[model samples]
Target: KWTPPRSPFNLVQETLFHDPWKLLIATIFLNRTSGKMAIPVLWKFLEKYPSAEVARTADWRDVSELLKPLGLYDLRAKTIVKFSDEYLTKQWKYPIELHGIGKYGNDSYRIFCVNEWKQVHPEDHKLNKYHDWLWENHEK
Candidate 1:
């Protein structure tokens, strides 16, 4: 297993949202997508569209076509269309009124890693041994 920098908070907000629509759009497209692959694609897409109004008003077909690298074209297209209709259609699109679900669509930015692995090697035959060790060393 690998380790990442220590951070108390799991999610962090850099600044107040001046462009809620753009940020929301980027967040949805980037969800479940790794930053290694997402950052470049997002940058290019944003460079082209540049704003929520453009994204919302553009043809869904074109938009989804551009999103091919992220995979799940049809699903992503549907999501984008839904976002445009709900958020972009209105003025003053604040984060509070962005109209996305709470479960996985909160649009919180995170940069952390938690690599907590139990003590189990290939040589170990027992499956629960690692769990036992973890519990035993809970104080440490």
Candidate 2:
């Protein structure tokens, strides 16, 4: 979300959040919202639930409460909990089969986890810029 690296060009997935699961969690908060608003709660939420296992076991109310800053908390909570349920239990594929994920979420996943930055075309302007910037300024 801040200054990305130069050579090993870091995305938020690597620099801020180390886990794909957590980054995926970020997609939920970030959808249709600015990072300025969603980032604070993203940290708060992740601090409480660090992994799919923990998130899956979380009370939906608590999750909903934490996500109150953002809209669609109920659905977000349900999606997260359900996504976690599938995350730990199921084998997944490209585009991350799930409920909450849409174009932006899948774009983030493909860019962050799959390193398919060149392959995927995001509809989000920021994502497009970030992805293009990585290649444009890539240096060793």
Candidate 3:
């Protein structure tokens, strides 16, 4: 059901397509997390306020109270605070993973789909070898 071909970009372009901080935090929060539980909480948290810069300034108590009902109060509170700080530092201009773009280009503000988001330069060595037929058919 995962129709990758219909996608406009390759895998690398897909993952890094959205907000880096939010996406990375989503990934971090999603590990071992159920989709039903994680999505609502994450959406609510982000909806109240978007952007790591704003998140970085949130009062610890306020963050804790907002997320305490989610059950990972201790961990999410600490992680979000640190994640926001790290994301806002001089190192990250857009997304955390996209810290350095010598010249490739950065169009993060435009990306909106998470499923379409991918790494900037995906590790193709392992996954690409299986697509010999694909390359041969597409080769010009």
Candidate 4:
């Protein structure tokens, strides 16, 4: 069976909600980790903490333990909670300085939060005209 190469973001884009918080969590898991390894863990984590608010209230030790098998689990635990705090508070701080994040993760944040690609290539999105209109008119 031939399988296509999957970008780290593919599973999240396909399976999870398009919420910025969810995508940020996926991005955190993907940093310094292959998509193959991160995807399943991402799914499990999302099942438990489906949104930023949920994660914000979560116990750090529990979250860290959940991520223990992934290596750098402590970093993941710290970064996700920090990221969630900034996100909920509307701080808008750039994430590059965080432990597990880098250029790719930063780019993912922009795409998920601000529709950076859509702004850059409004005509280049995969959606058809009707759906695009719905997105533009109905929600962020």
Highest-TM-score candidate: 2
| Per-model TM against the reference | 0.54, 0.84, 0.54, 0.65
Error of 4 at 135 (Å): 21
| Model 2 lDDT per residue over 1-140, tens place | 33334334343455443476887888888888877788888889888898898999988988998899587888888889988777777777853577677888888877766656668888886677777877776563
lDDT of 3 by residue, 3-22 (tens): 22323234332343355566
Candidate 4 residues 1-140, lDDT tens each?
21212233244543432465676678788766777788888888889987888887877789999887897888788788877776777655665555445666665544444445343322212222323443465433
In the range 8-69, model 1's lDDT, one tens digit per residue, is: 32211122123445556656655666656766676677787776566667777887788776
What's the alpha carbon RMSD for model 3?
Answer: 8.6
Q: TM-score for model 2?
A: 0.84
- Could you tell me the C-alpha RMSD of candidate 4 in Å? 9.2
Candidate 1 overall Cα lDDT vs. reference?
A: 0.50
Candidate 4: which pairs clash? none
Residue clash pairs of candidate 2: none
lDDT of each: 0.50, 0.75, 0.51, 0.62
Q: Model 4: runs farther than 4 Å from truth?
A: 1-11, 14-17, 93-101, 118-140
